[PDB]
């Protein structure tokens, strides 16, 4: 069942005495005319404790998991044995409970409804326990939740909170809050400003136009021998590395110094496409720092290589029945390169 | 009652740095509660225990807020916290999903997931244990030796801890300077009819000044009124006529 929290839920925010003044403060409070939850003791569920509860009824236990692992806080004489602390101490008995920045607040009022009542802090406890649920320990009561609302307080000559204003409920309350009084006169008053927010983002670019001619490089009919390896300049074009990356037709795709799948966004001065053919088992020798006949006399990568290496089998194009004798490789030399 | 002079003039502390409150004056002022946090870390990393510093410690282990009000003490302990065979009883967290909020402690030891494949709670490739050992030794360099650190956090309500300064007696209807739990000022101490609630402590003016005080020793409500002041005027005829004056 739902009931409206008409005007109750205000409390003294500090221990500072002010009288016959109007004070504006921002803190956590129970918003006016809020739907409360109703439970009856005619035949104790789990109730979350996200920020605070205005529990008014006409023991207690506050746990987080409640599996005898992260032991909770018990109130009868207060014993909090997570032990970590202990303490010994018609009728509308309203109470307020909240926890903020390692500080536990308890408020009370015992009166024998649309009325005003202010609660003073009792048994405040600065421990710092993590609490997320709420269970009563033992007839109808009510449960509500509080929100970060800005309130305008009224103090009388004796320093008792007798009136309050919810500065975010309705435009009349907004005008009262901005005029710092509980009565206003005729006229138009400025209250706040509105700003329409952006909906979605838009990014645009021109068309792709010319592409880099990877097709003719990779797809050509003839490759030169290793010892006379070719070379090409490629520039002034947009290159899609993703298409060649996600082809799954490449036996070996190793990258050095630069991670794949992110090449798509890095602008470079130049590229180079060195191509040749070597023995299949020997492909592992082409690496930045290896040694061997091929790596020492035919193609040596520097220690600071920055790029990727591609290779695949082509046994069914470059092999002839009579034996291909058009591929050569150096075997002797005076010194490495 | 806390006496900080014995700490300060000890000369056995390598570092004694104070933010917000200066030493040599701690034992004068009163404040609500302290908090002493203690732990042991490597010698080099001491500079990370300070507001606004970033790194492994100040990100995954122990983070101080930006409005810190306290003091930091540290001193080398190379002859207590090291062992011949290497001390592996001191650990520190290395990987975490996101940084820490101030004064928040983490204790769990679940396996970090550093890659795409979920680890399902077993360690392996790209599934690292999140804790590592310092490995202190008596022969390590001074940059790699154990240091003990104690952080004091003050919170500047009825104060309960402060210095050993003695109290004196109160006077009435006399322009004097007072000291109530560190609150200083000048005024005349007159009786007040204000009805403070039992938990009510002070009274504040519009200009954020104290108007009434509740004595700590004997619970009684006094009234503060600023001492007399004003301007002076000199009434003078022309000097060409006389030199007599009358002040106002």
């Amino acid at each position: 069942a739902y009931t409206n929290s008409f005007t109750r839920g205000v409390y003294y925010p500090d221990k500072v005495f002010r009288s016959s003044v109007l004070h504006s403060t921002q803190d956590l409070f129970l918003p006016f005319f809020s739907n409360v939850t109703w439970f009856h003791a005619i035949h104790n569920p789990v109730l979350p404790f996200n920020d605070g509860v205005y529990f008014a009824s006409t023991g207690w236990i506050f746990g987080t998991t409640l599996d005898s692992k992260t032991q909770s806080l018990l109130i009868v004489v207060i014993k909090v044995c997570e032990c970590t602390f202990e303490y010994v101490s018609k009728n509308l008995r309203e109470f307020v409970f909240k926890n903020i920045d390692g500080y536990f607040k308890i408020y009370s009022k015992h009166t024998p409804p649309q009325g005003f009542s202010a609660l003073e802090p009792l048994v405040d406890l600065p421990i710092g326990i993590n609490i997320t649920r709420f269970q009563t320990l033992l007839a109808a009561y009510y449960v509500g939740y509080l929100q970060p609302r800005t309130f305008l307080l009224k103090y009388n000559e004796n320093g008792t909170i007798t009136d309050a204003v919810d500065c975010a409920l309705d435009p009349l309350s907004e005008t009262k809050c901005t005029l710092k009084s509980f009565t206003v006169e005729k006229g138009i008053y400025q209250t706040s400003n509105f700003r329409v927010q952006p909906t979605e983002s838009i990014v645009r670019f021109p068309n792709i136009t010319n592409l880099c001619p990877f097709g003719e490089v990779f797809n050509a009919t003839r490759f030169a021998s290793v010892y006379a390896w070719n070379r090409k300049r490629i520039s002034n074009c947009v290159a899609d590395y993703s298409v060649l990356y996600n082809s799954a037709s490449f036996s070996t795709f190793k990258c050095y110094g630069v991670s794949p799948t992110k090449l798509n966004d890095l602008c470079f001065t130049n590229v180079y496409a060195d191509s040749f053919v070597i023995r299949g088992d020997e492909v592992r020798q082409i690496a930045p720092g290896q040694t061997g006949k091929i790596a020492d006399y035919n193609y040596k990568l520097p220690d600071d290589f920055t790029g990727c290496v591609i290779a695949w089998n082509s046994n069914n194009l470059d092999s002839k029945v009579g034996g291909n004798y058009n591929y050569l490789y150096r075997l002797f030399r005076k010194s490495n390169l | 009652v806390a006496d900080y002079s014995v700490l300060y003039n000890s000369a056995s502390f390598s570092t004694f740095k104070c933010y917000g409150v200066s030493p040599t004056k701690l034992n004068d002022l009163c404040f609500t509660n302290v908090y002493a946090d203690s732990f042991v870390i490597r010698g080099d990393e001491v500079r990370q225990i300070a507001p606004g510093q970033t790194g492994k410690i100040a990100d995954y282990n122990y983070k101080l807020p930006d409005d810190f009000t306290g003091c930091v003490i540290a001193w080398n302990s190379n002859n207590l916290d090291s062992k011949v065979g290497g001390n592996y009883n001191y650990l520190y967290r290395l990987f975490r999903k996101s940084n820490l909020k101030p004064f928040e402690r983490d204790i769990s030891t679940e396996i970090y997931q550093a890659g795409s494949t979920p680890c399902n709670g077993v360690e392996g490739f790209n599934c690292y244990f999140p804790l590592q050992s310092y490995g202190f030794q008596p022969t390590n360099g001074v940059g790699y030796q154990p240091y003990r650190v104690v952080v004091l956090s003050f919170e500047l309500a009825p104060a309960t801890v402060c210095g050993p300064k003695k109290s004196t007696n109160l006077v009435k209807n006399k322009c004097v300077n007072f000291n109530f739990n560190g609150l200083t000022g000048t005024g005349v101490l007159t009786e007040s009819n204000k009805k403070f609630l039992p938990f009510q402590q002070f009274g504040r003016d519009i200009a954020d000044t104290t108007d009434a005080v509740r004595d700590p020793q004997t619970l009684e409500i006094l009234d503060i009124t600023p001492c007399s002041f004003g301007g002076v005027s000199v009434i003078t005829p022309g000097t060409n006529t006389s030199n007599q004056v009358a002040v106002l």
């Epitope: 991670s259 | 077993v122 360690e123 392996g124 490739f125 244990f129 590592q132 050992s133 790699y144």
Partner: single-chain antibody, 230 residues
Framework: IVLTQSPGTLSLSPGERATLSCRAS???????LAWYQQKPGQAPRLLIY???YMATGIPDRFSGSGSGTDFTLTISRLEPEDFAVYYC????????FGGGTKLEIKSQVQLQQSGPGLVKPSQTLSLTCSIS??????????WNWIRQSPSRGLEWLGR?????????DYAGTVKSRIAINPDTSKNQFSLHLNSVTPEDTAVYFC?????????????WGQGTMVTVSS
């Protein structure tokens, strides 16, 4: 990930400094670089883990630094007994060693190895590494197998360990024909290779790794050689 030993070979005299280098193929986010020193005829020894932290019973001459994709080890004052070889190892998404640098000048836990040293080709190879001073089913440890051949250097074969049940990993080259079995009853773990080839001739070690010590090979074994021949 591939580690490249940057300086090739150095020769110095007693007294002055020495500077090494190690370069990574790409970033090591785990940051578990280590440095080993091996005298001839002996098992390697650990020097540094985490790239900065000293090992057990190591003088202060040794200091390491680096991060990201480069690292370096420095010797402050040479001593004419430090003619040895120095390696460079990492851990993370893959476990790979380094080439190593030649340098020349001018104990509560023990592992014991046993098994045949000669095998008829195309047969089974079996070794055993006994443990004295610890329990093979420890929660915070793992047991590996490392072999060394001059043509291939130092290579990682496989490992086993136990958290709640038993878990195994193996290197890609050797997946199809390798298996490791522990024996808690007599506190030993063994290595089996069903089939052998001539190139497998090498020297094998058994090692221990502690997860809280930077995943560094703390304790090694005596090591034995296996030759594949007629």
């Amino acid at each position: 990930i591939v580690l490249t030993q940057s300086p090739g070979t150095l020769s110095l005299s007693p007294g002055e400094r020495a500077t090494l280098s190690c370069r990574a193929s790409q970033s090591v986010s785990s940051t578990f670089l280590a440095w080993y020193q091996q005298k001839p005829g002996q098992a390697p020894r650990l020097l540094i883990y985490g790239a900065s932290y000293m090992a057990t019973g190591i003088p202060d001459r040794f200091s390491g630094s680096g991060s990201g994709t480069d690292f370096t080890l420095t010797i402050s004052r040479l001593e004419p007994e430090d003619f040895a070889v120095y390696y460079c190892q990492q851990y993370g998404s893959s476990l790979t060693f380094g080439g190593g640098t030649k340098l020349e000048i001018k104990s509560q836990v023990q592992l014991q190895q046993s098994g045949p040293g000669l095998v008829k080709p195309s047969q089974t190879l079996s070794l055993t590494c006994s443990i004295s001073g610890d329990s093979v089913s420890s929660n915070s440890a793992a047991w590996n197998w490392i072999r060394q051949s001059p043509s291939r250097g130092l290579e990682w074969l496989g490992r086993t360990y136990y958290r709640s049940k038993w878990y195994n990993d193996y290197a890609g080259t050797v997946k199809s024909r390798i298996a490791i079995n522990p024996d808690t009853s007599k506190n030993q773990f063994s290595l089996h290779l069903n089939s052998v080839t001539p190139e497998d001739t090498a020297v094998y070690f058994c090692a221990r790794v502690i997860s809280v010590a930077g995943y560094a090979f703390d304790i090694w074994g005596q090591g034995t050689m296996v030759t594949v021949s007629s």
